[PDB]
């Protein structure tokens, strides 16, 4: 199955095999308080990121979870968020679909 790389630089990030259907669907379309819309795809696992700062519960799109911004560890592109502090699963990643490129493994 296909893998996901950072659109800006090609860093390996995740895999289609690691999609996670949260609340029944791997895709959630959401807005932040600055009104930016995101098509977030949920993955159980990702790599090649760099998580910035400390976790926050504020404005979390997923109930019970705290988030941290996740950048591409290579180019710094904002690729999504890491979620933790929750239940079933405790942790996962929400990645912005249009910031990733999908392709062969
Ligand atoms: Zn990148």
UniProtKB/TrEMBL annotation:
Alphabetical keyword list: Calcium, Metal-binding, Zinc
Keyword Metal-binding annotated: yes
Keyword Zinc applies: yes
GO molecular function, one term: metal ion binding
Coiled-coil zones: none
Residues annotated for Ca(2+) binding in this entry: 25, 27
Protein name: Cereblon isoform 4
Lineage: Bacteria, Pseudomonadati, Pseudomonadota, Alphaproteobacteria, Rhodospirillales
């Amino acid at each position: 199955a296909s893998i996901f790389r950072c659109r800006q630089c090609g860093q390996t990030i995740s895999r289609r095999d690691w999609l996670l259907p949260m609340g029944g669907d791997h895709e959630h379309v959401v807005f932040n308080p600055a009104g930016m819309i995101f098509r977030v795809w949920c993955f159980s696992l990702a790599q090649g990121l760099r998580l910035i700062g400390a976790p926050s519960g504020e404005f979390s799109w997923f109930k019970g979870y705290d988030w941290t911004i996740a950048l591409c560890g290579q180019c710094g592109s904002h690729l999504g968020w890491h979620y933790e502090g929750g239940s079933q699963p405790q942790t996962f990643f929400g990645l912005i679909k249009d910031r990733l490129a999908e392709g062969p493994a």
